[PDB]
Amino acid sequence: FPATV
Amino acid sequence: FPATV
């Protein structure tokens, strides 16, 4: 999965 | 801490 903050 | 199962 892609990085989110 | 010591190992328990």
Added chain:
Amino acid sequence: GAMGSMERASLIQKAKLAEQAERYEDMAAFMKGAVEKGEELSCEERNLLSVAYKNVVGGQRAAWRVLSSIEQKSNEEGSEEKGPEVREYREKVETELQGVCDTVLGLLDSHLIKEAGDAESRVFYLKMKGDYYRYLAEVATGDDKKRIIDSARSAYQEAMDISKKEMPPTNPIRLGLALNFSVFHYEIANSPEEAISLAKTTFDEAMADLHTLSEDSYKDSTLIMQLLRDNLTLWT
């Protein structure tokens, strides 16, 4: 609410304790209590609120993905019929997840967003609104899917417009927003080109502004920039 009788400062103090103990459900309940006192949140308090719910829903999403994968496999050719249990349990986890998103969105609507006048607060809350509609969209399959996706897009877009007018390109909130909206485009809106363009332009405009920063601000900004780079590397 069960937190109605506790002091605002006591709720914030316990949220911090719950964070240290990695008790995120507790943290979230404390921060919900604090929001419901009706006063605006400081920068630190906004971060506690986001950390708490990010962790709770993050766990739920991971669980949902495990269960959904199992359920998909069950619906493959050759798979033996195991009854309604996998669907029922995926639905249970989904409903809980939706419940938490609805809670967070509830707090933002009543009344965090309408009272947020500074760029750093308003952009932050609108980014959260985008995020929790994005999580709802991840599990959405019915008549409202399109409207959920658009509710995410609309919140992210308003946050984006403010961030571009009112914040420097290296602002960690601006960066975080761009990172997540870019993921929205890739994973939810079926717009990988938009996702890539956004991540790239955000990265480059930040790079060109790093010279204005102190050592500590540089560290903060570059951390999030590396996450944009990580996503670009994944997608290209």
Added chain:
Amino acid sequence: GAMGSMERASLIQKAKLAEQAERYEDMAAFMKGAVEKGEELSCEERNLLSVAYKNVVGGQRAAWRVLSSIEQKSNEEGSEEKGPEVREYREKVETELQGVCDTVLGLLDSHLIKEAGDAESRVFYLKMKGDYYRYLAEVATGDDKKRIIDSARSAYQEAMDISKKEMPPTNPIRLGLALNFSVFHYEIANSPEEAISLAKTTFDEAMADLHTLSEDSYKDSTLIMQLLRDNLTLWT
């Protein structure tokens, strides 16, 4: 109970799904439901029950230890007075922990133990009873501390007597029991010599019986033996 309307097999199936999703609270609630159907548990079902509650209370204990440490520091000379919050939150986590122990002990008393006639089931349930009294003892500070400690010791001792009569020295249940009772001695009963003697004798008697085992039984037994060795290395 909220699980009263669900099929026994459905509860077991969902417990396994909850395990895969690392949803241990759910797992535990499913297994409690299954126990409350009133039928005896198979070997696999006993393990699901123990895994679930071990994980739930394990998390609680870690959180309790964080909070207790913070609370101790607050009561040190020079520490600024921060109010009742740290004690209140430690107490909250403690009460929840005690609640879960009481639930598990409830299940064993009504009526898992009294129906357990084979060595592998009875030793297992008595070991669990020892364990959940040991967790209660970890947080106990009042008039009942001694009786809680003795309730742990009594359960562990009965399990030990059965295990020595009815199981080979390499039996993983016998090994697991000895491991935990030895920790009981070290950490709860202030008997480090007994803890060490137990771990050592258990290890040595197992070593001498490994020759009787298959490759797979050897793997299982030696895994737990290494945990005895790990504890001995910690203590000597």
